């Protein structure tokens, strides 16, 4: 409706501006300047690179929401691929940060080599390669249609069964497995933090561990809080498709608008890192 037609571009432009500025600033600060580059800093640099690469493609979606899509099949496929790559890489970089914190806290003296290896070599194989290999459906199914009076850029499957399958696989790979890893690591970490009198053997090491662990906790909580309502909406939509939830057409329209507004709001995860750096780094 017209309400969405005016609401979506405004939020998209605000997010694009804030994400461009913040991610560019973070990348510039941690790149050529060569400022503090601990393992968490490396992981957040990877995260900022991914977030900026996705934020680059927001004006196309704003223009698609407002008027039409004059860009083409190649650009449709490119923006879908970039979206998928960002969506997987961000959450799995968060999982890698969680695992690194667990290794640094629980095994504080014998984990230097495993942490260095995990942050140097295993990170690419565990984050980027599966994300790239999961973009094959984006390369196959992303297309530009010719509906009435305008073009549409969206993934086109033979039927809704593929939609349900890809929604479920997105839910899994982006919420459960990294969620399970983060849950286990942070449960162990918090059990160790509130019971051990002094981590490692000196007070400075203990306070450093706490001061580096806390912002990661805040970032992970904010990330999942942003993404959760969209996941609830798509779960309800999938169950509607799976014939479990049977109601009238007004119900379907309501959940559709709910999902649209919620995904527009949950795209704010791209701005968490610069804002966290700003109000925890001054």
């Amino acid at each position: 409706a017209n309400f969405n037609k005016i609401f979506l571009p405004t939020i998209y432009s605000i997010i694009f501006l804030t994400g461009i500025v913040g991610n560019g600033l973070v990348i510039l600060v941690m790149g050529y300047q060569k400022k503090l580059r601990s393992m968490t800093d490396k992981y957040r640099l990877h995260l900022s690179v991914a977030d900026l690469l996705f934020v680059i493609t927001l004006p196309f979606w704003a223009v698609d929401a407002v008027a039409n899509w004059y860009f083409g099949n190649f650009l449709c496929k490119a923006v879908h691929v970039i979206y998928t790559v960002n969506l997987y890489s961000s959450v799995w970089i968060l999982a890698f940060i969680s695992l690194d914190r667990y290794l640094a806290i629980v095994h504080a003296t014998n984990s230097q080599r495993p942490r260095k290896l995990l942050a140097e070599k295993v990170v690419y194989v565990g984050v980027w390669i599966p994300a790239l290999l999961l973009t094959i459906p984006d390369f196959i199914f992303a297309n530009v249609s010719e509906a009435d009076d305008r073009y549409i850029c969206d993934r086109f499957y033979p039927n809704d069964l593929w939609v349900v399958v890809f929604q479920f696989q997105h839910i899994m790979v982006g919420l459960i497995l990294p969620g399970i890893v983060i849950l286990s690591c942070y449960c162990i970490i918090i059990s160790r933090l509130k019971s051990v009198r002094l981590l490692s053997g000196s007070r400075e090491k203990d306070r450093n561990l706490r001061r580096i662990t806390r912002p990661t906790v805040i970032l992970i909580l904010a990330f999942f809080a942003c993404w959760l309502p969209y996941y609830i909406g798509i779960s309800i939509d999938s169950f509607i498709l799976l014939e479990i939830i049977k109601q009238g057409c007004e119900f379907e329209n309501t959940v559709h608008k709910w999902i649209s507004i919620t995904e527009a709001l949950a795209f704010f995860h791209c701005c968490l890192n610069p804002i966290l750096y700003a109000f925890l780094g001054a």
Partner: nanobody
Amino acid sequence: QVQLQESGGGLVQAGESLRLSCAASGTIFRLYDMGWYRQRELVASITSGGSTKYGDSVKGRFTISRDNAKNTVYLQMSSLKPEDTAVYYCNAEYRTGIWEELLDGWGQGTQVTVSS
């Protein structure tokens, strides 16, 4: 912040028994170590797990106690000696939050007088 108060001192007849008290109140998340100090040699010290570490000249005569629910450390004095007349300082190690460092606190100071 936290507040530690000491009580139990005063003038008592020789050969009697006393029980010093030290209760901590304030923003306390967890307490790790407590002990009485008198360099200030730790004449007594009990950890959170009860692993007491008595002094050489105080072992076998003094008994320490700690009730975590009551947030107190009790030192029982028996078999008085002339060298035991001194000032007792209550010490405790606390942490105000999960992400905070290991904070250290001290007591007011208790005067115990025994005839020599």
